[PDB]
Amino acid sequence: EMEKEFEQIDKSGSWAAIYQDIRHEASDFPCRVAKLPKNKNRNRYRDVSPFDHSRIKLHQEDNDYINASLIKMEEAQRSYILTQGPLPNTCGHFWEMVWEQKSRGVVMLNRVMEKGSLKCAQYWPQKEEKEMIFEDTNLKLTLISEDIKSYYTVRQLELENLTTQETREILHFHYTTWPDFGVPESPASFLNFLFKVRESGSLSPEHGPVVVHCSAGIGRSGTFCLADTCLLLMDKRKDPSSVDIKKVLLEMRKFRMGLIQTADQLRFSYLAVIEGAKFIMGDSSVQDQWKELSHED
Amino acid sequence: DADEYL
């Protein structure tokens, strides 16, 4: 039905209108803590805040604020943590969160710099031989390896708690070619990237929620998560076609504002869920066709 | 400003 639905909307060109309806109907919950004066400097954007009911709380008894939201998708049974791109002063908080929430993967969908603007801090080591230490949160971070592809890069990081001298492996999945307020090049490139993430196990129920961010943590992040959850649902339901993408997006917006920032991102999500259904419904070969089409070399 | 995404 969603492909039937997708057809009417394109045919009549109503993406902007359909998108404005989602915006009109989205939830509005208080952001009290995010707005406290002492937390001014912990927010990259003063108009993108986590809701109080779903914000992630740092376990430091001084100030527990981080701009980050737990997105708990019940029917689909996946949780994601959506966050803003760490600021030079909240890098220690970010990794505190990753440690405390027991996350195994981090998905970064932006670049540190876009159109000459600073969009995110360099919060992970670019060189094996130069590790990072976050003094405020007593954590250590070390680049272990990095498989670089044409449009993304997977890294293996070692995060160590200096307090307890325990270490974990964190996988880092950086999509380098997704412009702010833009879409990926193709459904193929996106889906190929999403499936690399799934295949790493980082999304396994046995780990904390994967951390997903871009600069603000709503647009590309929202797009990434919607598509994933919708595909998840088409798998579970005895009826894959029933899945209403607009409804899933509204469910998700109960947990963080603004998810999906443009009408073209919404359109893209349909493309990606539709295409990705092919795999859900048995076409084994289709995944190799996204690898050849995404041009990951 | 710069502290606004929207």
To what resolution in angstroms was this structure determined?
Answer: 2.3
* Other C-beta atoms lying within 10 Å of the C-beta of residue A28: 8
Q: Does the annotation flag A216 for ligand binding?
A: yes
Architecture of domain A1-297: Alpha-Beta Complex (3.90)
Q: How far is A45 from chain B (nearest CA, A)?
A: 5
SS3 of chain A: the string is: CHHHHHHHHHHCCCHHHHHHHHHHHCCCCCCHHHHCHHHHHHCCCCCCCCCCCCEEECCCCCCCEEEEEEEEECCCCEEEEEECCCCCCCHHHHHHHHHHCCCCEEEECCCCEECCEECCCCCCCCECCECEEECCCCEEEEEEEEEECCCEEEEEEEEEECCCCEEEEEEEEEECCCCCCCCCCCHHHHHHHHHHHHHCCCCCCCCCCEEEECCCCCHHHHHHHHHHHHHHHHHHCCCHHHCCHHHHHHHHCCCCCCCCCCHHHHHHHHHHHHHHHHHHCCCCCHHHHHHHHHCCC
Distance CA A99, CA A71 (A): 18
Contact A273, A2 (CB under 8 A): yes
Distance CA A110, CA A4 (A): 32
Chain A residues in contact with B3 (beta carbon < 8 A): 43-46
> Any chain B CB within 8 A of the CB of A263?
no
Structural method = X-ray
Q: Does the annotation flag A180 for ligand binding?
A: yes
Please state whether A101 falls in left (phi above 0), alpha (psi between -120 and 50) or beta: alpha
Please state, in angstroms and as integers, the Cα–Cα distance from residue A14 to each residue in A7, A8, A22, A222, following that order: 10, 8, 12, 21
Please state, in angstroms and as integers, the Cα–Cα distance from residue A139 to each residue in A65, A81, A132, A165, A208, following that order: 18, 20, 8, 9, 18
Closest CA to A214 of A224, A227, A204: A224
Q: How far is B1 from chain A (nearest CA, A)?
A: 10
φ/ψ (deg, to 5) at A130:
-120, 90
Please state, in angstroms and as integers, the Cα–Cα distance from residue A250 to each residue in A225, A245, A260, following that order: 12, 9, 11
Residue of B nearest to A84 (CA): B5
Alpha-carbon Rg for chain A in angstroms: 19
Cα angle, residue A175 at apex, residues A170 and A176 outer, rounded to 5°: 125
